[PDB]
Design an enzyme around this catalytic site. Structure first.
Site, PDB file in Angstrom:
ATOM      1  N   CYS A  75       3.033   1.096  -0.829  1.00  0.00           N
ATOM      2  CA  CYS A  75       3.571   2.092  -1.752  1.00  0.00           C
ATOM      3  C   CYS A  75       3.690   1.587  -3.202  1.00  0.00           C
ATOM      4  O   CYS A  75       3.643   2.383  -4.163  1.00  0.00           O
ATOM      5  CB  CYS A  75       4.924   2.636  -1.243  1.00  0.00           C
ATOM      6  N   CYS A 157       5.943   4.159  -4.702  1.00  0.00           N
ATOM      7  CA  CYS A 157       7.254   3.531  -4.896  1.00  0.00           C
ATOM      8  C   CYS A 157       7.157   2.422  -5.945  1.00  0.00           C
ATOM      9  O   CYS A 157       6.058   2.041  -6.361  1.00  0.00           O
ATOM     10  CB  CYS A 157       7.764   2.974  -3.568  1.00  0.00           C
TER      11      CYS A 157
END
Ligand SMILES: *[C@H]1O[C@H](COP(=O)(O)S)[C@@H](O)[C@@H]1F
Length: 252
Positions: A75, A157
């Site tokens: 991520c 992320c």
């Protein structure tokens, strides 16, 4: 034949063969996607748009394909892009720990392809397909990219990077897919910073394009999602790739 139904290009020559061969190559190269049945993937892909009106496609049509193409991606190593696809891909072919959407299964399959069906037959239309602007926006291609882009942006992320084309009028374009989909699906709970890399087209253009009004617009939009912003000029893209290939070099 002298007058086609739509304004866009028809389904890419050999679309079925190409999607199928791309799926095989991808699953052969990427070990985590060994559980994938490439025939079932093609069939799910087909079911999204075959025998459907090519101006009435929905995200729901693609959900069986999304389910089969589910993939966990690191991520914190995501590279988004807007209007500078070639360099983004050149970069990830060298910096192998970073991923664009087209380095995922679903993105790899569809990259540079066009496709559509017909409402009145079960055939693929190789003659013409709807253009997003001139015909209709709810077409197989546009809806596919919106659906998969949203999921990909939602998975991101930590620090998310984006390559932007510094040579264009709007370096950040709010009406682009990046500006209208990806940007608004970065999750405030997960993403710490969006760092833009502004790629210069001119050799003697040494403006700080990170102070361009549209970059400030992006910064401001992103701050609402409690996401920090960072920006870097890539003055010399050819030197950039050289440095990416040979990072222990002193000049890099
Ligand atoms: C999501 O948006 C980017 C490129 O779209 P655009 O800004 O050039 S219209 C792709 O990674 C995907 F389509």
């Amino acid at each position: 034949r002298w007058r086609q139904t739509w304004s866009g290009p028809g389904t890419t020559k050999r679309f079925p063969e190409t999607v199928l061969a791309r799926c095989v190559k991808y699953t052969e190269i990427h070990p985590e996607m060994r559980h994938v049945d490439c025939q079932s993937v093609w069939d799910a892909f087909k079911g999204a748009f075959i025998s459907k009106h090519p101006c009435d496609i929905t995200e729901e049509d693609y959900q069986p394909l999304m389910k089969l193409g589910t993939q966990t991606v690191p991520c914190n190593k995501i590279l988004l892009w807007s209007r500078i696809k070639d360099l983004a891909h050149q970069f990830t072919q060298v910096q192998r720990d970073m991923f664009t959407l087209e380095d995922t299964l679903l993105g790899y399959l569809a990259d540079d392809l066009t496709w559509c069906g017909e409402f009145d037959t079960s055939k693929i239309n190789y003659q013409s397909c709807p253009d997003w602007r001139k015909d209709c926006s709810n077409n197989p291609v546009s809806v596919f990219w919106k659906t998969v882009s949203r999921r990909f942006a939602e998975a991101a992320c930590d620090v998310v990077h984006v390559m932007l084309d510094g040579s264009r009028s709007k370096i950040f374009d709010k009406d682009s897919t990046f500006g209208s989909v990806e940007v608004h699906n970065l999750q405030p709970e997960k993403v710490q910073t969006l760092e833009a890399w502004v790629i210069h087209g001119g050799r003697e253009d040494s403006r700080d394009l990170c102070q361009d009004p549209t970059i400030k617009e992006l910064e401001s939009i992103i701050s609402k999602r409690n996401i920090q912003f960072s920006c870097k000029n890539i003055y010399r893209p050819d030197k950039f790739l050289q440095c990416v290939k040979n990072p222990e070099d002193s000049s890099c």
